Design a protein around this ligand. Structure first.
Ligand code: NI
Length: 341
């Protein structure tokens, strides 16, 4: 059964609630983004209205084969009416097509559901500037001060400089980038741009990328692996055994691999600055873990919430343990006492 933090009170709406069968009283199912923990349960047999971004709707139709009659794509930054209730979708700064949802309830209550997000000061000049928010449904993934990591811009500078140096020293090197979901496309696109190459990948991953409305994408990606020196592979294959195996398949075109594993936060972020990061190496194979996050750091999250000044916060991540719930509630109260709301 559907938990309480996935239901929007005063409405017939749920958010990211497809794995519970038919939810009693739900007339519209919202999907914030195309990540499997959130879409879990959707398929071609789903027969209620799904509300989402255009990009999420392209993925639902082409990857999960949801029928078109049940997909309701909404434009961003635009007031829409769904089952008699005013809604707005806002860019979440997460993966492609990810949104936050503003609900203006009939009784005057205003609710913001962040979905998954990476808070940014640019959100302080969205359509949120105007107004009061009574309830915030918050992505609390990294809600503790130990969670630090660099800007996306610093991490991409490190990746492009590392890949450009390696291939300039060795023109016969191959670069590989792991993936297991949408998001983090800047990593492989920026590296291919500095090397003057298209990105090579499987037909399945190409299909996914073709649903994302990325400008000039046809100029940037390919299924012809042999024509490319930046390859995408499943994240599970980014290890010395899977990379050795891949190099065999390339028919003596390359004599070295440089590989990247974009992660979220890891333990080494407690100690090692991005500029100082080194790879794991075995023979002619090197593997870099790089902390490219699509969720808020602790500081980014705290800034956003102290700006917004919501009356009540409902966490949507780390809700399963009493220790996590207590820790999050203590930080919410600190933030409220410090800022005076
Ligand atoms: Ni996500």
């Amino acid at each position: 059964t559907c938990p309480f933090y996935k239901k929007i009170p005063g409405t017939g709406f749920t958010v990211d609630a497809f794995q519970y069968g038919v939810v009693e009283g739900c007339t519209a199912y919202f999907l914030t983004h195309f990540h499997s923990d959130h879409y879990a349960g959707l398929s071609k047999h789903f027969t209620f209205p799904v509300y989402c971004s255009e990009i999420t709707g392209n993925l639902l139709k082409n990857k999960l084969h949801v029928q078109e009659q049940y997909i309701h794509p909404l434009p961003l930054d635009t007031e829409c009416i769904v089952n008699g209730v005013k809604v707005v979708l806002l860019d979440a700064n997460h993966c492609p097509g990810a949104v936050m949802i503003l609900f203006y309830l009939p009784n005057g209550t205003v609710i913001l559901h962040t979905g998954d997000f990476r808070a940014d000061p640019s959100m302080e000049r969205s359509l949120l500037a105007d107004q009061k928010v009574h309830m915030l449904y918050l992505d609390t993934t990294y809600c503790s001060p130990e969670y630090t990591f660099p800007s996306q811009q610093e991490v991409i500078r490190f990746a492009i400089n590392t890949a450009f140096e390696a291939v300039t020293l060795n023109p016969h090197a191959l670069v590989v980038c792991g993936t297991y979901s949408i998001g983090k496309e800047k990593v492989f696109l920026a590296i291919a741009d500095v090397l003057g190459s298209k990105v090579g990948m499987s037909q399945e991953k190409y299909k996914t990328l073709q649903c994302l409305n990325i400008p000039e994408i046809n100029s940037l990606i390919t299924t012809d692996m042999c024509s490319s020196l930046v390859h995408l592979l499943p994240m599970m294959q980014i290890n010395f055994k899977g990379l050795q195996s891949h190099l065999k398949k390339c028919g003596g075109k390359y004599n070295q691999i440089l590989a990247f594993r974009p992660t979220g936060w890891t333990h080494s972020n407690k100690f090692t600055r991005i500029a100082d990061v080194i790879p794991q190496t075995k023979g002619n194979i090197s593997i870099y873990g790089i902390p490219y996050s699509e969720h808020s750091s602790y500081l980014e999250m705290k800034r956003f919430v102290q700006w917004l000044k919501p009356q009540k916060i409902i966490p949507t991540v780390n809700v399963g343990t009493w220790k996590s719930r207590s820790t999050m509630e203590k930080y919410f109260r600190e933030w409220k006492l410090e800022a005076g709301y």
